[PDB]
Design a protein around this nucleic acid. Sequence first.
DNA 1: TGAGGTAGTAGGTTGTA
DNA 2: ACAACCTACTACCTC
Length: 692
Amino acid sequence: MEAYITEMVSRERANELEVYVYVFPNYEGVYHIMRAWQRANDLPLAYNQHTIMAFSPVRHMCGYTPMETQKRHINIDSPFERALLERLIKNSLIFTAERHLHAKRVGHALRLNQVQQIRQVIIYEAIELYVNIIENRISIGFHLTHQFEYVYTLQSMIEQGKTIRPGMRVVHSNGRQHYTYSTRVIHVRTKEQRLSYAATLLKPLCTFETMQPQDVLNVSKCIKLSASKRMKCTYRWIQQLRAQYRHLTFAPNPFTIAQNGYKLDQLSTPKVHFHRDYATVVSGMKTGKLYKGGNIKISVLFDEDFYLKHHITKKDIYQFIAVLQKIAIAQGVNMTISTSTKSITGKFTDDFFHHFTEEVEALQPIFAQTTVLAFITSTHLSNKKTRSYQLLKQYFGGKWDIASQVITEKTIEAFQKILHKHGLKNFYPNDEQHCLRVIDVLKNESFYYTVMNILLGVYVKSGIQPWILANTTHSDCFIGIDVSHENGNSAAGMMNVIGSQGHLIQQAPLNGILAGEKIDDTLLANLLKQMIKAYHTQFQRFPKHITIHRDGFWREHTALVEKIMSHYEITYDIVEIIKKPNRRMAFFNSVDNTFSTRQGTVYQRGNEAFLCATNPQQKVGMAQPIKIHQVTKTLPFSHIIEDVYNLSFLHIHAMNKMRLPATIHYADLSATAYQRGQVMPRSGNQTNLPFV
DNA sequence: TGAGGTAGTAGGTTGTA
DNA sequence: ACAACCTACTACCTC
Ligand SMILES: [Mn+2]
Ligand SMILES: [Mn+2]
């Protein structure tokens, strides 16, 4: 029942390692000299900014004379030598893995033999290794993944009667620098560049999108391993590598958390507020009323294809909606359908979805001041000829500020299939008697979260707060910052889950410049002042503390934050959230000799921690940890971890728990929606989440 | 696009005594 | 050039 992490700390120390340093007379310095020495002398090496470090003397120098040669230790007070030693240790590990163990260096990983073969698709194993120096100690971390390839090359396809597309993606698999694009010549293009070489080298690219069906099923079955198999296969190769490595020594069992220095904490599930205290969200939603009800005016957008290509009539659509209005009335929410849709009856045909741009302008007054319930076939939404989803969002959210919920034909087909399979198909809706039986039937199957998620989307897009946290957080205000790349121009977002119980109060785009992952000083100051003013508008006071959650690495300027929060006399903390730590944590059970994972587990060391926030099934995979880093110091770090974990139970748009806290999960979605132009910055309203 | 989860693929991207 | 995150897409199973 011990706690295991994919890391190990060496018995040796950073300044106890004897190394050889060569100093020679751009960041690409002494690299060709490194390659020459590597080929000539057959020993691991590393370089950093015109300096080479080795573990053994270099006999042959290939006619190169270093300015200085030294046999010394590292200066731990200088991070330069720390980085150089880290690179040397990683290179030595790679060198020792390639020999004695038959490993290749492919891409960014180490290809490790073949594990599966699925109808001319080869699956290899692979591993990543990382070296860090923390307080005169060396820590090695490692992560196991997979790799895909096709057996046949383009040479085997030019013959045997097979064709080639003019511009399909092909791969030239070489050593560590693989690209993406008889003995016939194949002309290929990359970026803006034309070239050609032998067809035997190139192979077709292996991705999920391009693989034929009946292959994705089995590939997914192989590459979705449980906790036990993943952890065992990860530790077996590292134990194999320890035998051949002798520059550093480790413990007999280096993989526990005591040997790594972490300490263990176990958090608890917060209480949620549905007009009372509820243990879980599901319990509150099944048998409880909302925290803040109200009235909703819904409208209907129905396309004729439901009747033309499928067998769904408008009567069935209104029968489905009548079920929604009956579940909602039991939660304090009253929904009414606008009657303006009758004047535009018979519209929304194929021609309408082909000339949407011309036809939508006169359709605005019908759907004004309502929450649209679009009923569109998935073909229209997906087809690139129409692209109806993007245009609908751009014209309803990006203009006219109208919230809309989209439903495809698959949901209605599943609902109708379940309706037929349980009888009671004769009548529904009116007379308010068959609706109760329909709800009773629905409540005992898996098609209950679909209806509830549709309802939750409607509520949240129409200004309703389903529930909040029943206990206030340690801090009084949370500000979440997120950015998106989108291959060039970058859109960002600063948002407020400020309330100690959980309430959107304001959202704000970081449209101005921002280049990439950098917020201008004036922009940051103005946004912080706007956020604090927005908090002053509510609660009629100022917060005693503020916590700033940042998606990624905190690359901003701390002096401005300190000055601004000192002007208003508020304490502040800055926390980095890392959602891809590339580490795995698990509990080992010796009685059954198996691995497991528990939600709300924290491994903390110094001002860094790993948090477990999800509980996936065996066939879904193994839980992904979250890395929490504290940049400043004003509160205990355990309080920071507890607040981060608590703020993730606020997935008010879905009954399924999200891994990340609300400050990040509602910021990335907002940034993504704003980048595509589905939200206008004129309003920036509170408690409304059209993008959610 | 009912939503979440995890896990492959391809590319940015900022800092470097 | 090396590290360590980030972005986007696709696929499946769960509720
Ligand atoms: Mn994001
Ligand atoms: Mn949605």
